Amino acid sequence: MNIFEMLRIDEGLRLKIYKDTEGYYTIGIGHLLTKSPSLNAAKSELDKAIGRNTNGVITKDEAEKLFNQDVDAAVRGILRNAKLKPVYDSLDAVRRAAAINMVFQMGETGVAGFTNSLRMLQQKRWDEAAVNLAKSRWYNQTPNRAKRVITTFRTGTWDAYK
Ligand SMILES: [Cl-]
Numbered sequence: 001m002n003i004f005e006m007l008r009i010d011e012g013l014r015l016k017i018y019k020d021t022e023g024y025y026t027i028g029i030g031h032l033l034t035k036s037p038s039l040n041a042a043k044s045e046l047d048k049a050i051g052r053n054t055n056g057v058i059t060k061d062e063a064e065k066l067f068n069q070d071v072d073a074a075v076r077g078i079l080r081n082a083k084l085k086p087v088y089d090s091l092d093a094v095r096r097a098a099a100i101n102m103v104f105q106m107g108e109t110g111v112a113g114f115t116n117s118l119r120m121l122q123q124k125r126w127d128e129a130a131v132n133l134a135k136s137r138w139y140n141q142t143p144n145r146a147k148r149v150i151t152t153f154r155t156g157t158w159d160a161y162k
């Protein structure tokens with residue numbers, strides 16, 4: 001298991017513009033196109049992202065190229081963020097994958113607001129972090145995904161994903 005296979009389980013793969021759990025236009029492997037209610041705005045964001053006239057459909061290769069860029073972008077966002085980077089550096093390889101999953105889902109700014117959880121993760125207080133991570137809109141809106149990510153931070157294994 002790795003970050004790619006993890007996010008592929010959590011996000012799915014859809015080759016046509018769809019709305020995500022929040023109602024936002026999305027395509028591929030959780031690639032958010034726009035928060036705007038306009039499907040025309042989505043299509044135009046999609047065209048720009050892929051570099052051709054898509055009419056709201058992309059191929060598998062194209063969904064995987066977006067995925068690759070997005071995983072890369074989430075890593076680079078962790079490493080440039082003063083609050084995330086120290087936590088990430090302190091973690092083992094499995095729990096690093098959990099931190100990436102969270103940033104991919106909710107952005108660097110969102111994860112950086114989990115101030116208390118980040119401190120507990122940094123101190124390696126796993127059971128405590130997991131309890132605090134769960135007291136969140138994140139956990140209440142997407143409980144099954146959030147449980148898998150929280151289990152990863154708690155155990156340091158891929159058990160929630162097998
Ligand atoms: Cl893009």
Ligand SMILES: [Cl-]
Nearest residue numbers: 142143144145
């Ligand atoms: Cl969920």
